[PDB]
Design a protein around this ligand. Structure first.
Ligand code: V2T
Ligand code: V2T
Ligand code: CL
Ligand code: CL
Lengths: 9, 227, 227, 9
């Protein structure tokens, strides 16, 4: 189950 | 970072992101927040990306060590898992401290307030992932309360396709499924969020359409995994 | 790490590798070295893997920042490149200090002595990558001298297919090409190393054959890039 | 030009 990746920008 | 200019901290945060030096990036953005001024949209994203990467590495390591520890059940595996866990909790506490002093109370616009409250829910969720007892219930309720206030504002003040609103609903649905033992609530939220966004896509430009449909695909991916 | 048992440090280094926590892994292995006992073959590999990952991240970040700095030619990019550069130099100095106090002087067997001397050449090579003047020449000569002593021992004491001997020759050839401005020496060393290993492969077991041919492919890859 | 990766094991 994926949360927002939010690792870029 | 008290002796460095706010603008230099922001510039160096962007450089650290390009160098994939996320610990540095987080320290630079922490220094920028502690200058006491509100953060722009871009600056909020830099703060979020920095700490998400830092705690993302800690969570991944904690899961590896927790899995080894469960298979074993000397003190070394437990001791090292505890060390990583304490470091993760310290980073979460640092982020929560920044939101409480004083990002959230100065955030008046929907876009900033929802952004910070979603962050608050996320980092309490990360604390809940490693919590066990006496505090897990209160930590879970702290996450739920932050997410819920963010939801209430986003439903009142943002269109259903707003990427912040969509990402908040995505993460709240993950909270329901993974933390709160409420998979039906998780599925219902993801479905209603997806359907209401789909009906609003006709209002968007080509670039906004791409932004919103990307996050709707993440909701769809979860529904596919959960059903 | 003075209060932790040597065996616990080794165990935790292995756990940190599984968790991809290479900074921790390096600190654990540094503590193990400072216990003062010689290192086993496995323990040497743990020390090497830990610091190779740490400095590998620093070198990658330094290259990103150095490239941005060259394109610009405020002080921020230079300042941040300098900060990363100083941190990289500190890690290299730490490794070189461990080799000098007292890994190398207690290493009598060819497998341990060549391993440590190759390390010494590698970390002086990393220092040379970021050095400019007054010291770059002396740093380059320090790298060359370490590699050369390792070469001399490995040619006398190891078969041409020994993975340590092959990896030493590979890295010395990279030193020649990238640091010493001697591409013909780099190509000649890589070719002679490959050919002499090929002629010795018939002596090896199935598993040793796989170990040696893997590194010979790395020599071949470089020759393909250089010719 | 690649040195020994040496990042695993
Ligand atoms: C919680 C969260 C993080 C990141 C996003 C996102 O990708 N937003 C976005 C994409 C394009 N634009 C303009 N904003 C959403 C939610
Ligand atoms: C400098 C260096 C690092 C690593 C190797 C290597 O891969 N050695 C190896 C493979 C299999 N066995 C038993 N040893 C070589 C050289
Ligand atoms: Cl520990
Ligand atoms: Cl700096």
């Amino acid at each position: 189950a994926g949360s927002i990746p939010g690792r870029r920008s | 970072m008290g002796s460095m200019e706010r603008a230099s901290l922001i510039q160096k945060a962007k450089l650290a992101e390009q160098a994939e030096r996320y610990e540095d990036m987080a320290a630079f953005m922490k220094g920028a927040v502690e200058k006491g001024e509100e953060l722009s949209c871009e600056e909020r994203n830099l703060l979020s990306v920095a700490y998400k990467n830092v705690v993302g590495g800690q969570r991944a390591a904690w899961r590896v060590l927790s899995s080894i520890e469960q298979k074993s059940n000397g003190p070394e595996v437990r001791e090292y898992r505890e060390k990583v866990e304490t470091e993760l909790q310290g980073v979460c506490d640092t982020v929560l401290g920044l939101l409480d002093s004083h990002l959230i109370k100065e955030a008046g616009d929907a876009e900033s307030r929802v952004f910070y409250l979603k962050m608050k829910g996320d980092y309490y969720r990360y604390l809940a992932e490693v919590a066990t007892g006496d505090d897990k219930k209160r930590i879970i309720d702290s996450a739920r309360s932050a997410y819920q206030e963010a939801m209430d504002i986003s439903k009142k003040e943002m269109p259903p396709t707003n990427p912040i609103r969509l990402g908040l609903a995505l993460n709240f649905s993950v909270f329901h499924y993974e933390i709160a033992n409420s998979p039906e609530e998780a599925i219902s939220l993801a479905k209603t969020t997806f359907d209401e966004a789909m009906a609003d896509l006709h209002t968007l430009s080509e670039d906004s359409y791409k932004d919103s449909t990307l996050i709707m695909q993440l909701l769809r991916d979860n529904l596919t995994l959960w059903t």
